[PDB]
Point group: C4
Amino acid sequence: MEISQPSIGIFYISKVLALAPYATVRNSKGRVEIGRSWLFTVYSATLTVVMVFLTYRGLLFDANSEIPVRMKSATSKVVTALDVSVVVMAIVSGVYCGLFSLNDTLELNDRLNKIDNTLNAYNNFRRDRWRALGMAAVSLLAISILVGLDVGTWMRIAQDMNIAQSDTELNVHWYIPFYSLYFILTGLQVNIANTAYGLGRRFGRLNRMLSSSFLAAAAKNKGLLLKSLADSHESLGKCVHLLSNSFGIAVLFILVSCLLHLVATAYFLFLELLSKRDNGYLWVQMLWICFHFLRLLMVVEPCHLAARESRKTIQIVCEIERKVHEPILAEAVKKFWQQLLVVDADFSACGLCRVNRTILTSFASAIATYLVILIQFQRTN
Amino acid sequence: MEISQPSIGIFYISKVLALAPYATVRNSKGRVEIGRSWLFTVYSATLTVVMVFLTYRGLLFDANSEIPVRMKSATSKVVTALDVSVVVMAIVSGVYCGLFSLNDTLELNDRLNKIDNTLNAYNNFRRDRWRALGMAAVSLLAISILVGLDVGTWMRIAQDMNIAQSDTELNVHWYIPFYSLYFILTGLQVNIANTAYGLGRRFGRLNRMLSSSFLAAAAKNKGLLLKSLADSHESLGKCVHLLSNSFGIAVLFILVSCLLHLVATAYFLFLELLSKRDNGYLWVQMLWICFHFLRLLMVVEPCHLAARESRKTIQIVCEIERKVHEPILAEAVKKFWQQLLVVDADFSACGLCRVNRTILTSFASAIATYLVILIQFQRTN
Amino acid sequence: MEISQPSIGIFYISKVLALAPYATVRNSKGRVEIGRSWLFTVYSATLTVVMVFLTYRGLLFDANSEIPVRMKSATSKVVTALDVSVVVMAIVSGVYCGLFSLNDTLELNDRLNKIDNTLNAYNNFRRDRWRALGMAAVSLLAISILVGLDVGTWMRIAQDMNIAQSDTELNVHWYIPFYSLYFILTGLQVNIANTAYGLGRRFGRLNRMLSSSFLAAAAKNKGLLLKSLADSHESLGKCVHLLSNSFGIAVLFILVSCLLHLVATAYFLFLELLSKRDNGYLWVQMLWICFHFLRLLMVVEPCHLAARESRKTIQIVCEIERKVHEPILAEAVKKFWQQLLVVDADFSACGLCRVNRTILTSFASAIATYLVILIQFQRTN
Amino acid sequence: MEISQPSIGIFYISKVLALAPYATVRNSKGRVEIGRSWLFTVYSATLTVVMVFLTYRGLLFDANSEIPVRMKSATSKVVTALDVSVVVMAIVSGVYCGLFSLNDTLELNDRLNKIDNTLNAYNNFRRDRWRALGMAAVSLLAISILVGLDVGTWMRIAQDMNIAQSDTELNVHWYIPFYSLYFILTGLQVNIANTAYGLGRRFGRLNRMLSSSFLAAAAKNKGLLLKSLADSHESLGKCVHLLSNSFGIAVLFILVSCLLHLVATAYFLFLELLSKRDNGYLWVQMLWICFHFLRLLMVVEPCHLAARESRKTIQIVCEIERKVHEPILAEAVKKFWQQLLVVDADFSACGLCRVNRTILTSFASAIATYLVILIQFQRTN
Ligand SMILES: OC[C@H]1O[C@](O)(CO)[C@@H](O)[C@@H]1O
Ligand SMILES: OC[C@H]1O[C@](O)(CO)[C@@H](O)[C@@H]1O
Ligand SMILES: OC[C@H]1O[C@](O)(CO)[C@@H](O)[C@@H]1O
Ligand SMILES: OC[C@H]1O[C@](O)(CO)[C@@H](O)[C@@H]1O
């Protein structure tokens, strides 16, 4: 987890959402020291447990209700249970990662402090803060609008099914914990995206500095700068591995949630298309599909960018090798090439998969297959 | 995008088809200078928007018609919508790539000018021009014949369904924008194939020159030539990456269109086989399957050839290493081997997939699966 | 197969379960010498043949019985036959591997003796013995409890179907050989896990010793220690290959059994959910799913850990290269880096697949697909 | 294609089966010189065309017959057409490869002559001849027995369906060209297996010679021998590539035929199991499944062995590097290591796939999926 001053707003959002149970104090030097926040540790754990329990309580209440709104049919029951459970698993893994990633967070932020000292020329505090705030605000606004539209649509649907003997509006009101879980999931994804995008952006800054300083006393200082860049690259790779070690299970469950949600939302969209029962429902479902695709991108693109930018330092170093003659500088470039030869740049979600753009292809494949099988069964009866 | 005099006809075809919005002026030296053509930029954007709108207007008109010809049943409606949408997406991505790839086009053509100066011995302007013209003409003739056969078949089908109260021939006439989109797609594929085949052919010429000049003062000039070949190889790799960066989204949507069209056309072929309604329809559908397979090959084979030819320079350089003793020449060959060790040769379609022959296998797998699931559902009812 | 004093209990369990037909005598030095045990060789072969024959005899008896309990319907017959056959194949491959892996066992234990002499500082006999005994005891207790619950559930089910004219309890009693096969399978998995975890743990100990002795006369001895660590790494890789060569077919059939059991148990769980016939049956089936997942992990995690720990020596050696200057020590580190460059660390199950965590993903994919297809067919009729 | 005296019987079998249209004359030195055989070239082409035409003529005759025996139902018609077409495609690709692989055959046999001169110590003419003859004879006997059983079963089935007004035995007699195609396919597979096994066996002999001569004036001769072994390894890799370039399309169509035949034969086995119509049919179908699996192994195992043996020279060379000090010998070993670093050892079937044991896994996956989908559709109606 990256906790820097420009992105401190994302840290506070994650802290209140039970995802970053850390106490941060800003040094007189501008550095943010991080430590365990036992108050917020227990707050995060208790809030997650209570919200998961309330979500499943609302699910059971709807299922056992006189007139269920969402847990009506066996198919609807199964799909809604899966939909809620993937969110529960994703946010539970995220909260667990936040609870048990203090040491990795400290090491990552120390490494990033060193790297940013090395890459001071390419730093932009204003742009970084505004980008982080824009990402957090857009994600939170998107989930807020989507939750509002979903609640309105389901309230209308429950009212259409209302009978004087039973209230179906409270059935919808019992799904508020599920939407709270969705807000926590959005916060977790924003936090992870902030960290991974920071790593990829720093890799790009390192590559740009390399190209500027070697492709655009004095030789000794140049070699010292090349050494600093090599340590920065190695440290950024170790930071990517720290993010993997700390949040790979969260990323894996986010990916599982994304796949399940895409399949389930497309299936419900096509079921309502067959029924042609509520245009507002179709629009809300398409918005949900867009949101799930966008959060899949939010989790996949940062890691793809980080790996791609890390793996393109080899080419710059090869060109420098081809265009260098000083003995000390030539030795430094040879060492950098050796280092980059065996660099593992990809983000791993617990070793189950490598997180990059190829995942999208896999997802597409799976979705198509599952969508084709599910739709045909509905369309051949 | 490669814009050279021998293949200038392909460039003009792509320009009129809204895919190459560039102004080209031939230097007194025979070089083609490229710049933005704002007139043709707006022409391309407006033509694409108008043709997409007209295609979907014709689709809706058929769907809402008194006697739909193609958008008749829910299954037919879905499959026709997908068929049209994949073409729309492919040509829209191609036009977008053409609009926003001027800098990559300029860099690619500068690099190719340098490489062709290096590989002057193996150049064949006459053969290159005739190959490019033959590819463009065969592709355009194939799509023209296929569009004519499709229009005739659908006109006959609409006339067979005609009733005095409504005209079904205008329903067919409203699909002309879709066939225009098909012509644009053919132009885009011909352009991309021209560029990728040029890169693969230049890789092969480089390998042949290497083998001829090292396996078939003076030593200093030989080392200079080896250095020129090494820079040519690196530049061709960067050209492959320029083509990827500029047209990877277009290639990805071409691949998606190919997969969808193969599956959908095979499904309709087998549906009409079950119905046994029109032999001409079956022949036209088999021609469409052949065309979609051939355009899948047109997009996959050039990239496979480029990657394969790029990756076989390592073997020639290894043999030269094994058969060289001069100090300067030995150092040059060692540098070339180092360079080739870390060469990324494959064409990437936006990082989603690597474009080579293995894609065919994947496609086959997917098609088989989808074909098996779809056909069995139709055959078990 | 690893046969060491701390894990000798696992060896005896495997010996009685027909999986380790070896005679072991403890040297005065504490070394365990291993040789062929012809008495236990014939015992293992005969016991496996008799138990497989009795398992299939009980299966046929149930199928041909007046009131079959498990082999009732064609679907139930097929799924039960597959369930029994995967266990039979897994244990038969395990017993065959035990019979024909004496030379590999001897070489592996000699190599491990040398490695443990090298890594004496990080050895923990007490912890190793307690970990091995805990793994064996937990696995045996889990399978015992699961077999007891299964037998009780099936006895109750058979009694519910009992009629005065025929006894269905003997039908359940004829499945005892199948549960004996399950105990043998548990022993085989515990043995393989013990060996693979030993290899991964020794890789980790080697990496820790490297980091401690190089990142935390005298230089000559340090170089000698680095050489010892390099030989230890190469020997551990060869030990991983010995385990692969000896038990890859057993691991492959264990994986096949795991996939088939997960799919079949989930399918029966959902079938009984549709029927809602016996809550105890559902609980037993969920326990079986948990057990099959846990044994899939028991076979996949050790190999993933071994490969991961083997592949992270490259980074330590790279850092040492970056932080070393002595001529002899620098040459030693260069040799170690060369060695690690071309190290094949992954466990291979007969070349069919690489055993690591990605297998889980594959399994999940397959299961989902198969589960989706099977469930939908049941739910659309 | 390998044409050596020990395996000359396989060459003659392939020649008569239209697969090796070459004239071979044995030198006084024992070398076999190969040249184009125009007589046998036209014989091969004409025989293939005639047999394919007769096969499809018999297929159509059965389909159009009064009482079809095999081309009875739409499902049976489709599956039988696919079954015959995969064989036709495999043998047509094999015959085409034989026709257009004279230069590759000559280069491969020259390279093998050189390699066998280098590896004279490990040569065994008697064992090689007996192994080749045993493989050819076992394959031919297996296909002969299977064809006889199939013909007998189908003759009995046709007689059971015979009516006095029409003869169904001639319907079976019209499938003789299909069985002739099967004999040609067996010959092609035996030829390809002979060549690929020769390459893998020579790789193993090279590795054994390396280990014996370096791990079990004088130093100059030892270095010369190491150089000879390095050229032998490079030449064997080029021989593997020659086999790929010449017969990759044949191997690809053999693999496609194997997958289709396994799926189709399993499907027909389960269909007859549902019908329970003829026990002899079930036994013949299981024999066909065994034969198709065994020929899949015959095509997959040789390439897996060749690649595996080629890729294990790196380890021997690394150990020699670690255990060598002579300047010339150390340089020779360094060159060999450099060479092996970038060796592409795998057999490629036209770039579509790499032929090794992982293919089996893929096949299994596909088969399972397809088998599950096909069987469930039959079992849910
Ligand atoms: O299921 C359709 C959509 O509704 C939600 O459950 C929100 O309540 C989303 O998870 C899903 O995208
Ligand atoms: O759908 C069958 C065929 O007809 C087309 O739509 C052309 O109008 C093609 O896209 C397709 O190959
Ligand atoms: O089939 C459900 C479960 O019952 C067993 O067969 C045990 O008898 C297990 O193999 C399986 O997990
Ligand atoms: O189809 C079942 C079997 O019968 C054959 O067609 C032979 O005539 C084989 O190709 C197949 O294995």
